[PDB]
């Protein structure tokens, strides 16, 4: 008909005729096409799908049903390809499944459906729905899985994970990362495991970590990768700072031979999540108190206005066990530096002999003691192996180390599952405070709002980092009620008035 | 219809309506929820433009509305060295 | 849009708009001269539609306006010329822009028709007077005016 | 006993806790936006923190270029004196 | 102050501007002092030292407008048979609001949008009205 009206009609009638060729042939049978449209998408018949698209595009109200059907098909395919995974390499398989679904449907839309941006938006919505697929009355697992995927691929291991493929795998990972919609959880988890990967030297490549930081920056603005970039820069600058301290000590008038090698990793307290919750008054030994006080003097002299907060649960060392006739060398953790110093003077010690040498809570003492009882540096003098009031301890003379470099902190590099829920609670309270601030700002600014509208206003500003639930923001409202920030209006409970 | 331009120093600079509507943003300020069609004050407040610059801006308003249709070698607008680079930001903030 | 966004520049600085508004753009001896002639109002309007840099400056300092005002057939093709000028004025072409010799497009008119067309297409523009005062008095306008006002002063 | 070598980690924070240079909006310990480009020329040591009497902190390049034309502290409009 | 490019935190000025902006789209009352101060706020945002926050302002006002027409859509769609009168009331408010915001976003419209496929604020609010109010309700509105 386009050819026929080309060689039989005036130019002004080229379009109208074909319009009447459509409204009587494709529009009038929309109910026939749309009812078949669902069956076109599920079996993925590209030959029929392209013709259905180029037909329904002319009709005013034909495209949106096809868009909705494609979105539903993509969502169902994503659930089928992602919901059957069970552990093993689940963080990698989830990302690979979402990447494969996205890659299949992008080329399906581009090659077949003209590369239409409406179907691209439908694909984006379907992938947002499948990525954030959480079990009913449960917690979403997508940010944890993606963060574990990054941690698994970016760690140093001899599994053949070459460098020349990571920097292009991460560009593909950004595609699934853009659909998280819960980016606060991923940011916190990636910050924690980035701290673990950088402190212990588990990062396979510093430049690859910096590539991660820049990719997340390009994905979610600068403020997303603020703490992460400060972490990376601190770890990069720490070597130069150690080199500076290497000649600061020789530049003093009196050559103070400390007797130890110093490899301080000085870090920003406002970026790293390393928080010492209890008091835990560490009794620094005589071989380290001079070093720590002289380093404190160094910052009090060189980097003015920089308060130091020494935490001892990320630092390690090596102590010469000369009482056992040198059975190789061992790498050990700092909290039991006290535990083993009292054994230097007296062979047999107890809780009374160790309380005056440690001076902190019993929770730290019990776990640090069990860290040595199980690995058999310290044996129990009496039969009562369980923790009691006296609990006499002795150094194991008979036991000898076998491995040349004996490491007791393997337990250290294991992201225990129990701390995962602690980080989840930390994220929960962080977003609770963020929503508190958001409601205070909006309520102070506007001075009048409705119950159904205040939630929408809060979502409008809180969409940047996470998805606020309607039930949990309801609980947030009573928190402002308790803090006399808001109360229900006298005329109706729907309205709110600032006080 | 006789609007009042107030500078950052409180200097009232009452000028005619069609004179002050040459600048786009003064028209925008008088439009919207700034009309008050009561012909009482038509007050616009310039918290930033200094008086020695708003005076030159009002003189420009009069000079433009007088010489907008001449095209016969209109006299040059006298801009002092010190008024320039501060009259420029005023002529930007008050478009044209 | 993509073509201008990759910024194609002739060896003399003549961007696509400058070549579209120039009668000196060569046309080959084939049937093109019977259809495609320059300057073209439709080609200029199409270029201005697709985000062309209207105030683009070549090596001599000229812009699209400085080139179109020099049109040598200002009556027989007047409408086309007329249209082009208003198109430039409808796309933010600055009528006070000075080239490397400090010649406003009125000083480069070489024609009464283009001169009066551009005169009728201006505005009084106290911004232009202030920028001319800043340029003539050699006042250091660095970081003391908005970012756009720096290139605005650079125009004059 | 005796220690052959000791690994240590310590967190530092300013006594006056301030987060980001309000001029460039980047963090103070991060590179300024002017020096965030052309990293070959920069040695990652010129972007020193520049404090002031007003208890505000900026990148040295940011506040140095801001004081090139003006003489006022960016956030709190008072005279700027380096501390 | 003065018209020189100062540095302004975008959150503070945008929260100051949104109280006025939200009262303009729905035709509430705003004082001459506030309405005239918002022009200086927009000028300071579009000129802000060292890089202009014009694109940030446009993105945030686009986000607000799409988060405002969605609310009006949810309020109009929930009306079973009064959707015509609710749509007419909201359109009578929103057309004047869009015109007044085009007036108030004069510097953003001229010095930024025209200087650059971006859309003017008066054009953006109307184009977003059809995309988020009329197109979803196209099958419904005409049906009655
Ligand atoms: Zn800075
Ligand atoms: Zn720098
Ligand atoms: Zn200050």
Author numbering:
A (entry chain A): 246 to 744
B (entry chain E): 17 to 112
C (entry chain D): 472 to 627
D (entry chain I): 22 to 104
E (entry chain C): 1 to 116, 135 to 162
What does the original paper state about this entry?
We recently discovered that FEM1B, a substrate receptor of Cullin 2-RING ligase (CRL2), recognizes C-degrons containing a C-terminal proline.
An excess of the CCDC89 C-degron peptide was added to obtain the cryo-EM sample of the CRL2FEM1B-CCDC89 complex. Following data acquisition and processing, our results indicate the presence of two distinct dimerization states for the particles. The cryo-EM structures of the symmetric and asymmetric dimers of the CRL2FEM1B heteropentamer (FEM1B-EB-EC-CUL2-RBX1) were solved at resolutions of 3.39 Å and 3.37 Å, respectively. Hereafter, the symmetric dimer is referred to as dimers, and the asymmetric dimer is designated as dimera. The overall architectures of the two CRL2FEM1B protomers in the dimers are almost identical, as evidenced by a root-mean-square deviation (RMSD) of 1.66 Å over 1600 main chain Cα atoms. Unexpectedly, in one CRL2FEM1B protomer (CRL2.p2), the WHB domain of CUL2.p2 (WHB.p2) does not directly contact RBX1.p2; instead, both CUL2.p2 and RBX1.p2 interact with the N-terminal region of CUL2 from the other protomer (CUL2.p1), thereby forming the CUL2.p2-CUL2.p1-RBX1.p1 interprotomer interaction. Val7, Tyr49, and Pro50 of CUL2.p1 makes hydrophobic interactions with Ile44, Arg86, and Trp87 of RBX1.p2; an additional cation-π interaction is found between RBX1.p2 Arg91 and CUL2.p1 Tyr49; and CUL2.p2 loosely associates with CUL2.p1 via electrostatic interactions.
